[PDB]
Each structure stands twice: as C-alpha cells, then as structure tokens.
Amino acid sequence: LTGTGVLTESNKKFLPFQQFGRDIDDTTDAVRDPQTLEILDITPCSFGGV
Amino acid sequence: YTMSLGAENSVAYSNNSIAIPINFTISVTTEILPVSMTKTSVDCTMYICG
Ligand SMILES: *[C@@H]1O[C@H](CO)[C@@H](O[C@@H]2O[C@H](CO)[C@@H](O)[C@H](O)[C@H]2NC(C)=O)[C@H](O)[C@H]1NC(C)=O
Ligand SMILES: *[C@@H]1O[C@H](CO)[C@@H](O[C@@H]2O[C@H](CO)[C@@H](O)[C@H](O)[C@H]2NC(C)=O)[C@H](O)[C@H]1NC(C)=O
Ligand SMILES: *[C@@H]1O[C@H](CO)[C@@H](O)[C@H](O)[C@H]1NC(C)=O
C-alpha cells in the first residue's frame, strides 16, 4: 500500500488482525508497521492554495 | 388514507353582521433561512492525479 503522507504516532488501538485504517471517506489515515507492531497516523501533506 | 386539506369552517356570512376581535395574542414564530455553505476548494491536479 503506497502513498504520500506525514507519519505520526497514533493513539488508535488496532485489533491484532487489522493492518490499515480508514475514515468515513474510505481513505487510509491509520496504518500498522509490518516490522514493529505499532500504529501510525497518516496525515496528508500540507497542500494549499497560494 | 386520502388526505384532508383542513377542517371545514363555514364562515357565518351575512350582509349586515361583522366580527370584531375583543382580544389579541402576541405570537412569536420562527423562520429559518440558510445563508451560506461550506466554502470548498479542490486541487484539480492532485484530485485527478495525485
Ligand atoms: C355569529 O353568529 C353566527 C350565527 O348566529 C354563528 O355561526 C354559528 O356558529 C355555530 C357554532 O359553531 C355553528 O354551529 C352554526 O352552524 C353557525 N351558524 C352559521 C349560520 O354559520 C357564529 O359562530 C357567531 N360568531 C361568533 C364569533 O360567535
Ligand atoms: C385577553 O387574553 C388574555 C390572555 O391572552 C387574558 O389574560 C388572562 O386573564 C385571566 C383572567 O383575568 C388570567 O387568569 C390569566 O392569567 C391571564 N393570562 C395572562 C397571560 O395574563 C385577558 O384577561 C383577556 N382579556 C379579555 C378582555 O378578554
Ligand atoms: C520482526 O523483526 C523485528 C526487528 O526489530 C522484531 O522486533 C520482531 O519481533 C520480529 N517479528 C515480528 C512478528 O514483527
């Protein structure tokens, strides 16, 4: 699963079988690292209008 | 059911009778009007292509 984002620490406690996290709009905003079983929030990069 | 528009009210019309109010009610009613929406901006290039 690929993409671009800012990976921060997450307070969301996944169940052991779950790997990715989605919001209402079915976009991946939480993920589990395969090497170390920790949860990371994926905040989208700061795109904006100039 | 077949809907009923309102209760029937046969007004007691005659050529020489009038109805005069002896009292009044100060009635406050609410009217809700939308004014604005959420201002949304879309990056067309990022939405189509990322
Ligand atoms: C003014 O007078 C008329 C008739 O004298 C009244 O009308 C009647 O009202 C009763 C009450 O509901 C009805 O049962 C009758 O059928 C009505 N008659 C007619 C011919 O419409 C009227 O109510 C009176 N107005 C007031 C404010 O008292
Ligand atoms: C006109 O209507 C008002 C109510 O809208 C009447 O005021 C009421 O009067 C009774 C008896 O005097 C009291 O028990 C109520 O507490 C009053 N209500 C309020 C809200 O003050 C008034 O008396 C009426 N006047 C006439 C001439 O009919
Ligand atoms: C995978 O390797 C990491 C290396 O730090 C280790 O901590 C972990 O226990 C290993 N196993 C799993 C299932 O992640």
- Solving technique for this entry? cryo-EM
- Local structure of residue A6 (DSSP, 8 states): E
- Which tokens is B34 given? 């939308």
Resolution (A): 2.6
Closest CA to A39 of A2, A1, A6, A11: A11
- Which tokens is B36 given? 């604005």
Determine the residue of chain A that is closest to B41 in CA distance: A49
**Pocket test residue of B8, B9, B10, B13 for ligand 1, highest count of atoms within 8 A of CB:** B10
How many CA atoms lie less than 13 Å away from B30 in the CB half-sphere? 1
Determine the residue of chain A that is closest to B46 in CA distance: A47
DSSP labels for A7-49?
A: EEE------TT--EEE-TTS-EEEEE-SSS--EEEEEPP----
CB A32 within 8 A of CB A38: yes
User: In a 3-state reduction of DSSP, which class is residue B42?
Assistant: coil
CB atoms within 10 A of CB A29: 17
Closest CA to A43 of A31, A32, A33: A31
CB atoms within 10 A of CB A31: 21
Contact residues of A toward B, CB < 8 A: 4, 47, 49
